[PDB]
């Protein structure tokens, strides 16, 4: 398990394999950045050399969730009703990170946010259901996309998530700037 980095797929029994539409949790536990009332720096975590953005939680631990792009899209197409079966929520482009989450997600292939689309435009508002075949995600998401959402928390593949650290003094939500924690 190393010392300070924990990854869900790290299992000796299964020889560190992962497969299918599964989500992988990355946790950092370290005493250097464990405080929640001071603005310590986000820990620098990468998968295949690309940056993984980590949110601090109330236990003083840093969380991040990732999955394969095509498997998330293919699995999400089965979820015909929202927040049931394998729903990853809504597929947004990498550029949408700043407008939707409030921080940059540009070194990722795409993000999956738990909202619903009210105004199903072709461009500015992402894809609710995903593609049965998969591929590149190109539809973007904006700030007006979040406010118009009529049902939050539509992700069903992660259900037990720790509370993001609150905004006090110098500290932002999740210590990295989530718009709603």
């Amino acid at each position: 398990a190393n010392a300070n980095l924990f990854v869900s797929a790290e299992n000796s029994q299964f020889d560190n394999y992962m497969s299918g539409p599964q989500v992988i949790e990355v946790v950092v536990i370290d005493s250097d950045i464990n405080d929640t009332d001071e603005a310590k720096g986000e820990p620098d975590v990468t998968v295949n050399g690309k940056v993984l953005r980590m949110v601090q939680a109330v236990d003083g631990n840093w969380y991040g969730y990732f999955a394969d792009r095509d498997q998330a899209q293919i699995a999400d197409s089965t979820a015909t009703t929202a927040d049931s079966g394998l729903d990853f929520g809504v597929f947004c482009a990498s550029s949408s990170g700043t407008a939707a989450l409030g921080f940059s997600t540009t070194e990722t292939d795409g993000i999956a946010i738990p909202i619903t689309i009210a105004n199903a435009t072709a461009t500015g508002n992402g894809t609710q259901t995903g593609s049965s075949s998969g591929g590149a995600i190109t539809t973007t998401c904006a700030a007006n996309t979040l406010d118009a959402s009529t049902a939050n928390g539509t992700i069903n593949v992660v259900r037990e998530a720790k509370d993001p650290v609150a905004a006090s003094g110098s500290v932002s939500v999740g210590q990295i700037g989530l718009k709603n924690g």
Binding site: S8, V23, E25, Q71, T80, T81, S84, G85, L86, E160
Partner: protein, 217 residues
């Protein structure tokens, strides 16, 4: 889910021959505490594209030799909501095709034996049909015949569920050479037919009608 306890529900009846019917797999039709937790959505035609290699499908055959008496039935437990949809007096609890899920009757209705498994720990990868009270979804029928069997399949490797009886042995064990007045010595019975639960310790209580035999002096 890496943070939660994962629940899966299967349509396993391999002898439902209705043209519309197919063996199928569903995700989170229940919770780990036996709540609703959402609708049932088809996964059968997509399992090829989600990296499934003969390992995402559960099938069951209640009567393998077609003797007329079904060996295995299904029952409710603490991690599922199963209901007897045919409540007619003409049938009983040994009819596996008389159970279904009430909220999801298109694909998990009468016939099409629904079977539910639950994850033993948030991020373990080990699933079971038992609940925390040790009550399995799958039970052997009360009128089952010796020698007959059922067949359960995961990962395209079937296993037989054989029904059999066990010879018993009783033996009083005197602590020393002679049993004298005012001394407790053990009496030991070995009969596998009274071990009806492998996850629980069982007592031969007079008052329980389902304990069929009790020692007597």
């Amino acid at each position: 889910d890496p943070t939660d306890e994962d629940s899966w529900t299967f349509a396993t009846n391999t002898k439902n021959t209705t043209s519309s019917f197919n063996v199928d797999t569903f995700y989170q039709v229940f919770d780990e505490n036996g709540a609703s937790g959402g609708s049932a959505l088809t996964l059968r035609t997509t399992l090829s594209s989600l990296m499934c290699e003969d390992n995402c499908v559960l099938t069951l055959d209640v009567d393998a030799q077609s003797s007329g008496t079904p060996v295995v039935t299904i029952q409710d437990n603490g991690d599922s909501i199963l209901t007897q949809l045919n409540a007619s007096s003409n049938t009983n609890a040994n009819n596996a095709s008389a159970f279904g899920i009430s909220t999801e009757t298109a694909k998990l209705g009468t016939g099409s034996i629904p079977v539910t498994i639950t994850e033993q720990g948030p991020n373990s990868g080990v699933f079971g049909t038992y609940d925390e009270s040790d009550k399995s979804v799958l039970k052997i029928t009360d009128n089952a015949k010796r020698g007959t069997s059922a067949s359960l399949d995961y990962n395209e490797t079937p296993q037989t569920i054989l029904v059999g009886f066990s010879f018993a042995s009783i033996d009083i064990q005197p602590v020393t050479d002679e049993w004298t007045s005012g001394q407790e010595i053990p009496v030991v019975i070995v009969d596998a037919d009274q071990n009806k639960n492998s996850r629980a310790d069982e007592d031969l209580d007079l008052n329980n009608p389902d304990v069929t035999l009790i020692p007597a002096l």
